[PDB]
Amino acid sequence: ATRWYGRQPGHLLRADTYWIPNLVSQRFAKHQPAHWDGTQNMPIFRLADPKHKDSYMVQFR
Amino acid sequence: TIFAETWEASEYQYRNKANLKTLPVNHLGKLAELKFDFVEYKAHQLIACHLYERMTIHCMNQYGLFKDFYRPECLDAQYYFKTCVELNAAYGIQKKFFPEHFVGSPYARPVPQFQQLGL
């Protein structure tokens, strides 16, 4: 049960200046209003998981 | 017995044991290491362990079994063929009499009936 609850991914901010591709690309990104759909788990950012397509450059050790 | 050319790699991995071996598909790259000319159809290369068997026959027809067959491309073909049919015979028996050892089997981790939940 503990391992299963731990795999439900946490929310990790998209804003990142540590990776040089995001440091350049995010200067041209447009922040759009994320309309609330009635939930408490809207993944409007990236997810704190090593296998996520926007978090693979992060070292989860 | 596998009744197809392709098999799911995960269905031959263990669920409750450490996975130290896989059951890989035929190594088609070894077919290009044969220096001589031979005829091979693509319809025979995917069925398990048969490509290594045909490679061994081609090598034992070009060369013999003495001082000419003893080259790295021919000995790896015979070793792969012998090893492949040994692993598949063991995995085949384990699939037949121990199906609950593998990922994807409904008995590896059985889901209970609703009558056992006490609701």
Add this chain to the structure above:
Amino acid sequence: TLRAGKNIEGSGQVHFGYHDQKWGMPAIPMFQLMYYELPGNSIVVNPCRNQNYRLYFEMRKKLGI
């Protein structure tokens, strides 16, 4: 231990968890007088093995050797 079927996480014998450790003999005369390392050459086959040679002596006499 690994080949015998026990997978090993981490390494070493400095157990982080709930296990006893053995640090190794302190190289001072106090512990070097009480303890000494296990000499492998002292673990022997039991000498009762030599009593099987009684079978040979009796067989040689039966065969008239």
Add this chain to the structure above:
Amino acid sequence: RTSAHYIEINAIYGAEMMKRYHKVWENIIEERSKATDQEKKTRYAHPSYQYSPLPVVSIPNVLNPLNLQ
């Protein structure tokens, strides 16, 4: 440890008994070849089996596939 007497004596015993089995095996093949298809299918058969003939086909009686003695 397993007895070294067993390992070496059993290795000799098994081969010596194989030579005597080879002679018995030759007599059984010879005696069965001279048996009717009815006898070689009903002898040692289950009691509940009813014999029904098969069409006569040509099947050679080869002792050893490789030409060995």
Add this chain to the structure above:
Amino acid sequence: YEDFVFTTPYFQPESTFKSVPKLFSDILLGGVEWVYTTSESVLAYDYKLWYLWSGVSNLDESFDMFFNQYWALSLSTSVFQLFYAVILDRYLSVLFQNTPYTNDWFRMMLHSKETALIWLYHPELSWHINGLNQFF
């Protein structure tokens, strides 16, 4: 009960007065392990031999003569072509059983390198081996 059904088998009250004698059992937190390290003489440089059972070398006894002769025999068209395939599959199920009663280490018949040539004369003994292994 109170508008709730808890399905249970029939209870047996006779199980209450069950004679259960308490037996001695002591747990020793801190005891013996499986293996222990010894200290003996060690050489500076050594060599480790490897008796590789490659099966592709006809120079030593690892060459599976039966498997190669009966496989090459099944390649040619014969009336026993399907029978030879069944024999080879039964031989592969015998090598799969490496029990104390079927193995080369203890020099068992039709499992060691010594008796590898006997398969050429009597391939019918695979069923005897598979049954003998199940018995012991």
Add this chain to the structure above:
Amino acid sequence: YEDFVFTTPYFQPESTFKSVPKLFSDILLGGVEWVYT
């Protein structure tokens, strides 16, 4: 059988034709741990 008794319950031959549809299940050697630093 041959001078041997092997006690087993009554076998049900109908269990042979049991419709068991295969379901997807993939194993990922190399995945996520419980905690990270």
Add this chain to the structure above:
Amino acid sequence: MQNTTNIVHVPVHMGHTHYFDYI
């Protein structure tokens, strides 16, 4: 058993990229 072992019930596709491993 490998400490990083998971069983997934839905299909996923992994990236064929050097130095990285992700879905």
Add this chain to the structure above:
Amino acid sequence: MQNTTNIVHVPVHMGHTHYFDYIDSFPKLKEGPTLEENHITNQKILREQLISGQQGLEQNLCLRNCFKLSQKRYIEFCLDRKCGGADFQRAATILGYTK
């Protein structure tokens, strides 16, 4: 679970000595006869067996070897072929296997 954990079914007594941990004694341990007293006792048995227990031995050794076979049908075949047509229940009484 502690790696050096053992479940023992017989009582042991541990020594309460500094720097050492071992089993110093077993409760109610009775010492039997010495190795020499057992030797003299065994020699009296082996001497009687050598002098008066060697007549008609070949028949009993054949019956004992037949009863080490796996199946009963092979034991009967051994008794009929090797032991001069002995009966199964009769040979089992001689060897002491009958209740």
Add this chain to the structure above:
Amino acid sequence: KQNEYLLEHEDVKRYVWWYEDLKETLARVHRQANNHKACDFKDSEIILQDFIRRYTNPKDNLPIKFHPQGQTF
């Protein structure tokens, strides 16, 4: 010399006769068609079913009965 007699038991003959019956049965098995269907061995199923019917009782609860010296693999 002590165990030479065991090769005279009739079970040795019964074992060889079973092996020769399997050889003749598998030699008679043949491919009948090339329709890539199960009926390509239509007549062979009858030949093998006759062999199985010859050493078992199909109308039993357990036609294949377990004994410690039997065949499992």
Add this chain to the structure above:
Amino acid sequence: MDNYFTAITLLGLRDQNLPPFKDARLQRYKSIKKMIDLIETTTKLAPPMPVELFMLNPTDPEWDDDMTYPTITH
């Protein structure tokens, strides 16, 4: 993939070649499924033979000596 040589022989790979298209080729694989169940059943009907024929009983008390191999330390 057990019964390899049996399945390869039933498919005809010892004398001919499989159809070059996946439709008929994959149907030919499923065609031997009945025959493998038959041939496997036949191989499990072998009668027993004395185990003490080519193998001495290892549980015999004669082998309790646990004798070692005497060697020469050349």
Add this chain to the structure above:
Amino acid sequence: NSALIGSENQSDSMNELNTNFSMTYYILTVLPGKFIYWIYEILHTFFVVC
């Protein structure tokens, strides 16, 4: 591990049969070749970056 002094990584190919299919006299033929290409990599890098 063939370059380590008293290695304890017994599971990293220390207790396995490891043969290759390269040229023999390894430290005379193959190993210097890997170092020759290393010198080319850095000399080519120094020429480019400068």
Add this chain to the structure above:
Amino acid sequence: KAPGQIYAYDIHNTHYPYVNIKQDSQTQLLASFRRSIASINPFSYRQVPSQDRAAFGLRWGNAWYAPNPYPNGIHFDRVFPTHYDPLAETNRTKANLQLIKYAPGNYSTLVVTSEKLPRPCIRTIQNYRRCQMVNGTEKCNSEAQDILAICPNWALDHMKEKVRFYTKALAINNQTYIRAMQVEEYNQGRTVADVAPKTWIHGTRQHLRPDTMWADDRYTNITQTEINEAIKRVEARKAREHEKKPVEQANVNANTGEQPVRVEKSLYP
């Protein structure tokens, strides 16, 4: 008192077959020269073992030969995920300490093994069986209790589990029996009397033509004209079969957040 020779000595008739797998000119020329002088060469090594002398394996240049290990996708990363593919290269690259560690058993197969029960536990089992076949089951209570007492508990767990395994294997063998002995729809009412007098060779290529157009010379004299007329006939037969076609079924794997059924894949993407 001559030393025994293995069968391989009679194949090669010598103890010094200078077998080197490395197929370069320098190696094979030196091997031929060394093979001829091996009778009088002090620097000669045997590659055929005997009872009196051990031997070496196959040579690879100056080093030794071993086949490429069978492809095994199992590996363990150290610094970064390498995505090791055993089928991407011919020879397996060596394992570097900072890159990868391969699975154990470079040369290993899968077998089934069994532990050997303790000798005293075996003696009590033999005593129970012997007392059983002589006196019957009901008079072996003393021998049955000696088994439960003398045999350690791990042995009693193994003995209990062997019975459950062979019970499982017994049902698996009988289910295969029931499928094998099942009478199909194409064999209804057919017996051994309806079998054709044929053998295995009657279904081979010489007697039964394979399902390919160039297996023999059957269609080698066909011209374009006969092909066009054959197309008109196969399309005429389709004027009666195209009237039937299965209806489109529901997609059982429509929900992506649901465990999909391992359905048969399409022949083509």
Add this chain to the structure above:
Amino acid sequence: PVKEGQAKLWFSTKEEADAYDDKMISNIELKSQDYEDENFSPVFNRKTQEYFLEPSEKFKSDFAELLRPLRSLSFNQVVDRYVLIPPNHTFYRNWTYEKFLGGFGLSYLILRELPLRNFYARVFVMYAFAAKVLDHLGNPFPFSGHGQIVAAADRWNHWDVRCYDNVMKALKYIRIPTVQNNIPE
């Protein structure tokens, strides 16, 4: 037209047979190499004869050459010759490895006396000789590892330790760790 041969079809009626030929003929695509043909293909010309993989004459003659010494012998002579080798455990079998590996040391005794004038020229020679040894020794540092020698597999491998069970388990078996990560009880 359709040519008949030894290999026959598998159909009961003639309508089923003729339907099979029509299906196969309607799929034929002629590829001719001559110009002025309605079916002309310089490249991508198909063959009209199917290839079959068979064991050649060299194949079957060499497999029969491996069994030459067995044909002149009976089974009892084969067992007494190659199986029932009389036990003689007095030989120095490892002399083969001692002479080979010990020759490295004896070769160094003679090689260290080379009349090469330059000291650094002999530095090169010893580096080449160390390369020859290190293919077998592996690790040049002491107390670090073991040498690697592939030896022939015969019936006398480990002959004097066949009695020990733990030696067989350590050499042969690689056990698979379970979820309950423990050594077998």
Add this chain to the structure above:
Amino acid sequence: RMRYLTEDPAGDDPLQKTKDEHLVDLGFIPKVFGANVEVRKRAPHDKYL
């Protein structure tokens, strides 16, 4: 949804659960059930992820 349907193998330790041998001696003979081989795991609504 994928992480919701991501489980680990082998579940929990069976030795820490109620034994069937203990229930028999307590007066309740348990009934043996078969595996539910027809149910497919699915993810809940997004509000529960």
Add this chain to the structure above:
Amino acid sequence: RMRYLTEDPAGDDPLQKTKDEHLVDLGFIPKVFGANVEVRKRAPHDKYL
């Protein structure tokens, strides 16, 4: 005799043995037994230690 009667806890892995849910779906309904609470472990004769 003490080391002969020295066992380790928990035995072997229960998830590596034949399941009861699998036997039921194979056609064999297993029977549940009770614990043998009456047997006392003892060491064999000295010749077997």
